[PDB]
């Protein structure tokens, strides 16, 4: 049972909480697979080895259209290799925001697939615990292809050490300690909630606040977009989001619910908008943040940032790359108050996360992107800088930002061409065709 003789590694594919996904080619069978590489040094193993191996064997025995099929498992002296089938379609929410129309029917199909997979896995007595939209992938880029869930049953054995974006979906019983499979349902519920509103039912500025909200267990449907949503869906959400597990609806029961039953043979535009805002700011938001960072800093800020950036830009090309980011990281953090005693590997890892704040994805971090990093969001997106920015964008001072004004500030000046119209619409909540300060602020602060 050895990896190198069985599979061949090529290039990194995706980012996982427990380990990193890499595309691999097979020696003898000549097929492409996806391997999750988990580090014994980086992550802790909760259960003993034999238990993990047993669970993995059971997983290798299993098969369902809505779960990630697990082919092989390899244990290296240093690392763990978890081999399964490949996925090219990417995460679900991205595909959702890619499309123009999103109705309760689509969400019903999605949740049906999810709950089907969940029901199968529960039939074999397996619990995910950590269920997120990221764990929902599409096997192919083809439209209306079905969903496959990944990292099923791995959470029980591993606990990561890196942590905001799992608090939205975690179940109260999981937070309090011991739990059963129904926690997954709760998680699914949360997703469904988002799917219909584009906002988390339990929300907060940071992990602590979000966890406070979910632990309190209280939530509402007061948001305006819920007026566009049928009552049955809200009822199903209520049954899924009950604090006490025994009273909570099971996955199998939920699969036969009235909502999912009926809606599987209007458009929730504000919802999908809020999903786009939720997701990576694939919007006017990135351009606005970059503009604010590069052009709207005070003299002291510009001086300090330019100085530090010069110190980190070793070859002086005007870009920061992986190596320069690594060599300059500890000193940058030393500058930002917050790490002398930092292991080279976690330094490379955090440097990689910052490489995930590389908006244009050219592989380099510019000065503007760098300003987002060096300046905490509290300062860069203060009330003052936001107001000044909005005032700059709003030339005629009407109180709203027009498409033409956006085209004027940072524009090739194609007001038509559906460029600026599409870019505007992604932020235009009330559909007046303009951006008031509320929407600008919500855009840059991910607020609802």
């Amino acid at each position, epitope marked *: 049972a050895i990896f190198s003789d069985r599979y061949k590694g090529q290039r990194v594919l995706g980012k996982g909480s427990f380990g990193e996904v890499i595309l691999c080619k097979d020696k003898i069978t000549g097929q492409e697979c996806a391997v999750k590489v988990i580090s014994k040094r980086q992550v802790k193993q909760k259960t003993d080895k034999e238990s993990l191996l047993r669970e993995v064997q059971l997983l290798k025995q299993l098969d369902h259209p809505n779960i990630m099929k697990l082919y092989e498992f390899f244990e290296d002296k240093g690392y763990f290799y978890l081999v399964g089938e490949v996925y090219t379609g990417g995460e679900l929410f991205d595909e959702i925001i890619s499309r123009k129309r999103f109705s309760e029917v689509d969400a019903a199909r999605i949740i049906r697939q999810v709950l089907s997979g969940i029901t199968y896995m529960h039939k074999n007595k397996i619990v995910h615990r950590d269920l997120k939209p990221e764990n929902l992938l599409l096997e192919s880029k083809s439209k209306d292809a079905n969903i496959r869930i990944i990292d099923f049953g791995l959470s029980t054995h591993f606990e990561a050490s890196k942590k905001i974006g799992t608090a939205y979906y975690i179940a109260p019983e999981v937070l309090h300690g011991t739990y059963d499979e129904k926690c997954d349902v709760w998680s699914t519920g949360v997703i469904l909630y988002i799917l219909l509103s584009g906002c988390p039912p339990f929300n907060g500025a940071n992990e602590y606040d979000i966890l406070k909200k979910v632990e309190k267990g209280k939530y509402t449907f007061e948001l305006p977009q819920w007026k566009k949503v049928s009552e049955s869906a809200k009822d199903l959400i209520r049954k899924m989001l009950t604090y006490v597990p025994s009273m909570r609806i099971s996955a199998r029961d939920a699969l036969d619910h009235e909502w999912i039953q009926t809606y599987t043979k209007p458009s929730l535009d504000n919802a999908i908008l809020n999903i786009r805002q939720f997701q990576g700011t694939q919007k006017l938001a990135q351009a606005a943040l970059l*503009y604010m960072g590069s052009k709207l800093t005070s003299q002291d800020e510009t001086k300090e940032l330019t100085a530090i950036f010069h110190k980190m830009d070793k070859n002086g090309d005007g870009q920061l790359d992986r190596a320069e980011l690594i060599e300059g990281y500890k000193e940058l953090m030393r500058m930002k108050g917050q790490s002398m005693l930092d292991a080279s590997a976690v330094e490379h890892e955090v440097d990689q996360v910052l490489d995930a704040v590389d908006f244009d994805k050219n592989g*380099y971090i*510019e000065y503007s992107e760098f300003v987002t990093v060096a300046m905490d969001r509290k300062t860069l997106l203060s009330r003052e800088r936001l107001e000044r920015a909005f005032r700059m964008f709003d030339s005629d001072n009407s109180g709203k930002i027009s498409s033409t004004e956006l085209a004027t500030i*940072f524009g090739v000046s194609d007001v038509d061409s559906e460029t600026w119209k599409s870019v505007l619409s992604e932020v235009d909540k009330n559909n007046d065709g303009e951006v008031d300060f509320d929407e600008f602020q919500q855009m840059l602060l991910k607020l609802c």
Partner: nanobody
Amino acid sequence: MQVQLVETGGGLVQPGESLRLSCVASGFTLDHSAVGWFRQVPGKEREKLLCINANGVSLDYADSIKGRFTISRDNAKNTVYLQMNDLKPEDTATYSCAATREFCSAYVFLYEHWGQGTQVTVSS
């Protein structure tokens, strides 16, 4: 005066020839400016070509112009140069230059003080 960049050196040339373009700053100095050259073909969005910081050079464009175009800098003469070699019928377009503070960006929209540019035409 007011603040703008002016381009010169635009003309008609045979394929495979060489041409030199100039960008002069009026109303401000290039001392703290990173200047980049961009080419726009009619009905197409502006394309990053090259950029020079206050000092160093970056090849922003796709590698189609790599090794053929050089960007130069003379602060005293307030001028940025673009040396174009081995011209192709692919290269004919409007060439203009823009400036951002200190460091060369790779987002077109962070640039300012755009110029009317110069017509560069390669024979067909």
